[PDB]
C-alpha cells in the first residue's frame, strides 16, 4: 500500500546501513533520478537521515516529482523545493494498483486555493468554490469536494497507468554517522601516512594518540584554521590527532 497523493508515508530511516543496492542499475525502475548527489556515489556518502516519501501517481505526472517543478501534483499535492538533496525513484504498478473496473482508492487534490509548501501534506476535505456563489456545503453547481479519484485501470494508456514513486529526501551527515552505505571496518593504524574515512572527514594524514580531553558529546575537533585537529575513533573512542604527511 502506497498513499494517493494527498498524504504520503514519510517514514524516517536512521541508525542503519543504507545499502542502496545500486538500485539505479536494477532496471526495475523507469525513473531513478538524483539531484544533489551522484547516483553512483550513494554507497560512499553518509546522511544524518533519509526520509522516504511514498505515494501513487499517473505516468504522465512522473516528471512533476522533481524540485522546482510546477503542475497539478507539483503545486497542489506533493511539492519539492528548488534546493533539494535526494533521489526520485518510480516504477509501473499495473498488477497492484489497477483494477478491472478501475481502482478508485487513489485520489488527488484537484481543487485548491493556493500552492502547497515543500514537503507539507494537504490532507484537506474543505469544499472549494470555483465560482462567485458561496456554495456553502452544497458541493455542486460551482463547488467541489476537493479530492478527485483516478481511473487506475489495466488497459488504460501508459500515461494513465499508476506508478509508484518514492522520494528519498536526504539530510547530509552533520551528525555522528546515522545512515551510511555498506562500509567495512578496518583495523586502526597509528603513525605512518594513512588515507582515512571514519564517518566522513575523509583525508590523509598520520594518526597518533591525542592528549586532548573531549567533552563526551563532541566526537570531532578543529584548529584555528578550521581544519580537522583530531577525531574520536567511532569505536572504543580513543582520541587521535591528525598530522599532515611530510
Amino acid at each position, epitope marked *: 500500500r502506497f498513499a494517493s497523493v494527498y498524504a504520503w508515508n514519510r517514514k524516517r530511516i536512521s541508525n542503519c546501513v543504507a545499502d542502496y543496492s545500486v538500485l539505479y542499475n536494477s532496471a526495475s525502475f523507469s525513473t531513478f533520478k538524483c539531484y544533489g548527489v551522484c547516483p553512483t556515489k550513494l554507497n560512499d556518502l553518509c546522511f544524518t537521515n533519509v526520509y522516504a516519501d511514498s505515494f501513487v501517481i499517473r505516468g504522465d505526472e512522473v516528471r512533476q516529482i522533481a524540485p522546482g517543478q510546477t503542475g497539478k501534483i507539483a503545486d497542489y499535492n506533493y511539492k519539492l523545493p528548488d534546493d533539494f538533496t535526494g533521489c526520485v525513484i518510480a516504477w509501473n504498478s499495473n498488477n497492484l494498483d489497477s483494477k478491472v473496473g478501475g481502482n478508485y482508492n487513489y485520489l488527488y487534490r484537484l*481543487f485548491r486555493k493556493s500552492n502547497l509548501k515543500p514537503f507539507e501534506r494537504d490532507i484537506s476535505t474543505e469544499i472549494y468554490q*470555483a*465560482g462567485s*456563489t458561496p456554495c456553502n456545503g452544497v458541493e455542486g*453547481f*460551482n463547488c*467541489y469536494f476537493p479530492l*478527485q479519484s483516478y481511473g487506475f485501470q489495466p488497459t488504460n494508456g501508459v500515461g494513465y497507468q499508476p506508478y509508484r514513486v518514492v522520494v528519498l529526501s536526504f539530510e547530509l551527515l552533520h551528525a555522528p554517522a546515522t545512515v551510511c552505505g555498506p562500509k567495512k571496518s578496518t583495523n586502526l593504524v597509528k603513525n605512518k601516512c594513512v588515507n582515512f574515512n571514519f564517518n566522513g572527514l575523509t583525508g590523509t594524514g598520520v594518526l597518533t594518540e591525542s592528549n586532548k580531553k573531549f567533552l563526551p558529546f563532541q566526537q570531532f575537533g578543529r584548529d584555528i584554521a578550521d581544519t580537522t585537529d583530531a577525531v574520536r575513533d567511532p569505536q572504543t573512542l580513543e582520541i587521535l590527532d591528525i598530522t599532515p604527511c611530510s
Partner: antibody
Amino acid sequence: VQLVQSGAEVKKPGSSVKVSCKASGGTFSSYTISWVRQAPGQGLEWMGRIIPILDRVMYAQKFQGRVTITADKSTSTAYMELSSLRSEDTAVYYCARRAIDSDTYVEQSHFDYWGQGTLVTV
Amino acid sequence: EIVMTQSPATLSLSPGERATLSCRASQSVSSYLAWYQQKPGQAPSLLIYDASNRATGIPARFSGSGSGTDFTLTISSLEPEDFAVYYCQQPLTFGGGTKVEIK
C-alpha cells in the same frame, strides 16, 4: 453543436425509461450536459447534470432516486434513466449544453444547443 | 434550493409596446442567470447570459440588468414574434416564467 436525442415512448408504470444524447467531436471533455424536464404546456425543471470530464453528477433534490445520469467516453454520449415511471410523470425532456466550461474548471452559468426533447408517457 | 418568482404571470401588450419582465430570487444567485424565450410546445432559446448580456444572434432590443436577487429584462419594443414565455434560469432551477401575449 448538436445533441442527438432518442425518440418518444410509452411504458407501463415502474418500467425504467432510458434515453441518450449523442454528439460528435470533443464534447465529452469540453462541455457539461444537463437534463431538464418539460411537462407539455409547462415551464422547465432541472433534473441533474453530468460533468463527464470529472466523472461527477449532481441532482435536483426532487429528482433524487428517480433520476440516474451517466456518460460514455467513446463518442460522447450522455445517458439518463428515469426510474419509477408513473403516469403522473408525463413529460417532454431534453439535454442541454453548459457552454461555459474548461479543463481548468472555469465554471458554468447558462446553456445553449438545447435538444428540445422527447415525450415519455404511460 | 434556490427558488424564483416571476412577474407578471402574464404580460398583455400591443405590438410595438415596451415590455418589462421581472425575476425575483429567494436568495442570491450573484449574476448566474440566463433568460430564455419559449414558443408553445418548445424548449425556450437563449436570449441573455450572466443575468444581463445579450446572447450572440440576439437583436439589440433585448438586454437586462440586476444583481443578487433582483433581475429584469427590457425589450425596448416588443414585436409580434417576441410574444414568447420568458424564463429566468437560476444555477440549478428555473422560475415560473412570464407568458407574453398580444393584447
